[PDB]
């Protein structure tokens, strides 16, 4: 037995030092059972986009051909706690 | 008139280039109306704690006397999209 945290969103009990993914509201948070005597959990959310094997900061842009269309796209990383991006024709 | 975004959480319309705060689920997201031809909004959330005039990364710790109790506290920055921290006596 070790000190634990209980995550009401995954429904699981973790031991202090465990790290895990918490699906919440169509996001994935990256969490750690800290404990701190009180079952305290620390979670971070990604503020970056991952597209086509590249990583982008929020506000970064990139251009690429559409994969079946062949017309150029300009894309921007939005983030929104989901690694969301948007592309449009150029 | 300029191109706009509509934020369903604040209920406001923004013009492209506007930045604002979006209260959502007891958090504050920092948003920008990007537009990108389609009313696209980009939002970031803080993964840091601000306590006693200091800034802390998630997982940072600090010690301080309790402000009315005078006993030592050990604190840790949890984050959780809220700049949340926890303290206990030491």
Curated annotation (Swiss-Prot), chains A, B:
Disulphide linkage map: 5-33, 31-43, 49-77, 75-87
UniProt-annotated stretches for the region Required for binding to LILRB4: 31-50
Domain Fibronectin type-I: 3-46, 47-90
Compartments where found: Secreted, Extracellular space, Extracellular matrix; Secreted
Tissue note: Expressed in the inner limiting membrane and around blood vessels in the retina (at protein level). Plasma FN (soluble dimeric form) is secreted by hepatocytes. Cellular FN (dimeric or cross-linked multimeric forms), made by fibroblasts, epithelial and other cell types, is deposited as fibrils in the extracellular matrix. Ugl-Y1, Ugl-Y2 and Ugl-Y3 are found in urine.
Post-translational modification: Sulfated. Forms covalent cross-links mediated by a transglutaminase, such as F13A or TGM2, between a glutamine and the epsilon-amino group of a lysine residue, forming homopolymers and heteropolymers (e.g. fibrinogen-fibronectin, collagen-fibronectin heteropolymers).
Subunit field text: Mostly heterodimers or multimers of alternatively spliced variants, connected by 2 disulfide bonds near the carboxyl ends; to a lesser extent homodimers. Interacts with FBLN1, AMBP, TNR, LGALS3BP and COL13A1. Interacts with FBLN7. Interacts with COMP. Interacts (via type III repeats 9-14) with TNFAIP6 (via CUB domain); this interaction enhances fibronectin fibril assembly. TNFAIP6 may act as a bridging molecule between FN1 and THBS1. Interacts with TNR; the interaction inhibits cell adhesion and neurite outgrowth. Interacts with FST3 and MYOC. Interacts with SVEP1.
Function in brief: Fibronectins bind cell surfaces and various compounds including collagen, fibrin, heparin, DNA, and actin. Fibronectins are involved in cell adhesion, cell motility, opsonization, wound healing, and maintenance of cell shape. Involved in osteoblast compaction through the fibronectin fibrillogenesis cell-mediated matrix assembly process, essential for osteoblast mineralization. Participates in the regulation of type I collagen deposition by osteoblasts. Acts as a ligand for the LILRB4 receptor, inhibiting FCGR1A/CD64-mediated monocyte activation. Secreted by contracting muscle, induces liver autophagy, a degradative pathway for nutrient mobilization and damage removal, and systemic insulin sensitization via hepatic ITGA5:ITGB1 integrin receptor signaling.
Illness the protein is tied to: Glomerulopathy with fibronectin deposits 2: Genetically heterogeneous autosomal dominant disorder characterized clinically by proteinuria, microscopic hematuria, and hypertension that leads to end-stage renal failure in the second to fifth decade of life. Spondylometaphyseal dysplasia, corner fracture type: An autosomal dominant form of spondylometaphyseal dysplasia, a group of short stature disorders distinguished by abnormalities in the vertebrae and the metaphyses of the tubular bones. SMDCF is characterized by flake-like, triangular, or curvilinear ossification centers at the edges of irregular metaphyses that simulate fractures. These corner fractures involve the distal tibia, the ulnar aspect of the distal radius, the proximal humerus, and the proximal femur.
The protein's name in its UniProt record: Fibronectin
Organism of provenance: Homo sapiens
